[PDB]
Amino acid sequence: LECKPRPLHKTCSLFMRNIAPNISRAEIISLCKRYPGFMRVALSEPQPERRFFRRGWVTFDRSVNIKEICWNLQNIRLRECELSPGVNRDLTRRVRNINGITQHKQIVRNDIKLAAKLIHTLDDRTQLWQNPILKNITDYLIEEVSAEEEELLGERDEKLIKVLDKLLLYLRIVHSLDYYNTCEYPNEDEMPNRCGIIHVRGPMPPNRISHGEVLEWQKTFEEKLTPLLSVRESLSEEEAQKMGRKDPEQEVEKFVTSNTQELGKDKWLCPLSGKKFKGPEFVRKHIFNKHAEKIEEVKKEVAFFNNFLTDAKRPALP
Amino acid sequence: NDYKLDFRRQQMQDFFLAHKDEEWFRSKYHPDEVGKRRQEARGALQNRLRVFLSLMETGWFDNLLLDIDKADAIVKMLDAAVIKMEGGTENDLRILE
């Protein structure tokens, strides 16, 4: 005799409109963990237009009364930010159609190439695994024709579509990349619905599919997909030096000389330990050997600053 | 004597000092949190990979295309994926029937 089935796909949740960037996930988790049937918290990417404020989503079990939980958290501030949540209702329209030209042979044949490159790049980017769905994938891209038979004597294609679906379903289920819409949903795994909206081919064009219009769709569609495989931008070696890229070993040397303070003649007290020494060479040996935890943190602080400084597509105010 | 370079640099320096301790900023650039969040992100993606391969071999993509004719079948497949993502056995899928 077997146990009851669990409807895990259904989960009710809260929605907080404005969360300050000074608030961490742990503060929101610890706030909502005291309520029964807590699952997980999601936070959107902070937008510079709203002074880097995020949108929250606290997910719960479907068994619990979300309306009473929403009421209890109504007038509760965190640090100094009123959370003031509302009940997030379920997704109404999850299968959204697009233009019906995407079931044409030439677009389907082109989309197999593009979808394959999206998988090839993202599997190397995230570093999984080789992917078995891409075995002999270029064999479907090449055309097979009876050209010799025509020379002497003188629409929907289901085989290609079955191949494409496996790639698009992989992209959407694994990498959370909705292919036909041309967009990622990066936080989905934390969000209330783990696999929400998917985009789907249209019914069929009522008129003839034009000869040049097929080429215009392919040009416009790859233009929409190009930002999805965007490698993170970095400034040049000269431009980073102008903005002031801190050298790791030089900045560590500044940390040593600042801590190596001279109390008097033959008296070199450092404030890190609080122990006297006879010369500054002995204080350097003390800092490098004994306080090896601190010199690592100085190198982390410089890398932390340099990673922010190097990134050309930098988070800054509008 | 470039004003623009000094302005962009001072804005950048004032930004780093202001958003130093914040968790969103630490997650993007601080080596320890970038290492921890990427390993957490990879583990979640490896879980989703098993769900896809489970839906492959079980046959939830067996006779299912991405067309609005089969809009009802896609929603059922999507719910089947989320159940498997949450650690749902084959018994747990029966509520979809």
Mind spelling out the 3-state secondary structure of A173-236? HCCCEECCCCEECCCCCCCCCCCCCEEEECCCCCCCCCCCHHHHHHHHHHHHHHHHHCCCCECC
Q: Residue A95 pairs with which residues in a beta bridge?
A: A198
Question: How far apart, in whole angstroms, are the C-alpha atoms of residue A278 and residue A85?
Answer: 62
Question: How far apart, in whole angstroms, are the C-alpha atoms of residue A65 and residue A288?
Answer: 57
The answer to whether residue A137 is domain-embedded is: no
Domain ranges, residue A196:
90-129+155-230
Pick from A214, A200, A166: nearest CA to A93? A200
Q: Does residue A293 share a domain with residue A184?
A: no
A313 Cβ neighbours under 8 A, 6+ residues apart: A232, A233
The answer to whether residue A73 is domain-embedded is: yes
Tokens describing residue A91: 């997704």
Q: Does residue A215 share a domain with residue A96?
A: yes
Q: Under an 8 A CB cutoff, do A317 and B15 touch?
A: yes
Interface membership of A217 toward B (CB under 8 Å):
no
Among positive and negative, which fits the CA dihedral A131, A132, A134, A136?
positive
Pick from A62, A65, A58, A67: nearest CA to A32? A58
Question: How far apart, in whole angstroms, are the C-alpha atoms of residue A252 and residue A237?
Answer: 21
Query: Scanning every residue of chain A, which has its alpha carbon at the shortest distance from the alpha carbon of B23?
Result: A24
Q: Which of A230, A263, A281 is the last residue of a domain?
A: A230
Q: Hey, what's the torsion of the CAs at A215, A219, A220, A222, to 10 degrees?
A: 130
How long, in residues, is chain A? 318
Q: Does residue A180 share a domain with residue A207?
A: yes
Interface membership of B17 toward A (CB under 8 Å):
no
User: Which of helix, strand or coil describes residue A58?
Assistant: strand
Interface membership of B52 toward A (CB under 8 Å):
yes
| CA distance to partner chain B, nearest, from residue A210 (Å) | 22
Q: Residue A96 pairs with which residues in a beta bridge?
A: A199
Q: Kind of pairing, strands A198-200 and A95-97?
A: parallel
Q: Which residues of A touch B52 (CB under 8 A)?
A: 169-170, 173-174
Q: Does residue A220 share a domain with residue A98?
A: yes
Resolution in A: 3.2
Domain count for chain A:
3
Q: Which of A230, A264, A286 is the last residue of a domain?
A: A230
Question: How far apart, in whole angstroms, are the C-alpha atoms of residue B67 and residue B60?
Answer: 15
Task: Give the count of beta carbons closer than 10 Å to the beta carbon of residue A245.
Answer: 15
Question: How far apart, in whole angstroms, are the C-alpha atoms of residue A200 and residue A98?
Answer: 6
DSSP state of A67: H
Q: Which of A230, A255, A281 is the last residue of a domain?
A: A230
Question: How far apart, in whole angstroms, are the C-alpha atoms of residue B81 and residue B79?
Answer: 5
C-beta of residue A19 within 8 angstroms of C-beta of residue A57: no
Q: Under an 8 A CB cutoff, do A126 and B45 touch?
A: yes
The answer to whether residue A63 is domain-embedded is: yes
Instruction: Name the residue ranges covered by the structural domains of chain B.
Output: 3-96
